[PDB]
């Protein structure tokens, strides 16, 4: 049984469910319509995302979704993170109501806006702006002592207004290195060597992951290290190997990626330094190409 928090509780008759946005088997996300979410108007509908459990859910799977909601309540609001909007915790299945990003993840979005081969296209100032927002989201998360542990283009969602929002920042701590994603990608490729070989996740290991994220932006949703299996990736990290400079990527932004991949975690930039640099770079980057 669950206790009511009146700050966040939404009556169940105010949530009209819809088409599913994602799956697991670890839970499921659906598209929904929340009636009068805001204090005024109680007659306006907001399109939302509803996190819920599957039929084959256990007490562990349930405590995991509670902790996530609980984490989001503590962390607070930012324009560049997926915010918490409400919850249905009484007399039925637990529904954690979060922000809905109509354009999907940042990898899918970037891939769908690639140049023709072989209706909407992003300029140089556009790509750098995506990097700025994600570093803004991550810096707030860092200010609130949150360590993402899986910062990647896949876990950055995009709104109808082209705002970048960090997602799955509140997920349960609980990893199989040989496991691949839905898109058949190995998540170990976003991991800092200290986190991968010593299990030491810090704000510095998330900075490493931001470096893999930039490479994903300026390659327009490119796959890091294609064809490279798990065991061959460890050898690449031990030799001091680094990814190649994307084409249509400045010397300044590649120097940034490489700094993010500094072998020594203490020597890497902070998100507070990355927000500042990208703030300046956007202002100097051309919107004409
Ligand atoms: C063919 N395909 C159909 C579904 N397409 C799609 C489009 C937008 C989408 N937004 C989210 C979504 C979440 N999955 C989500 C989450 F998992 C945790 C927290 C917040 C979230 N907010 C969302 O808005 N899913 C989407 C799927 C992609 C293309």
Numbering used by the authors: 464 to 581, 592 to 647, 651 to 765
Q: What do the paper's sentences say?
A:
activation loop conformational energetics in FGFR1. function of FGFR1, as has been postulated for other kinases. crossed in the transition between DFG-in and DFG-out states. kinase suggests a high free-energy barrier for the DFG flip.
which has almost identical affinity to ponatinib. inhibitors is not affected by the conformation of the DFG motif30.
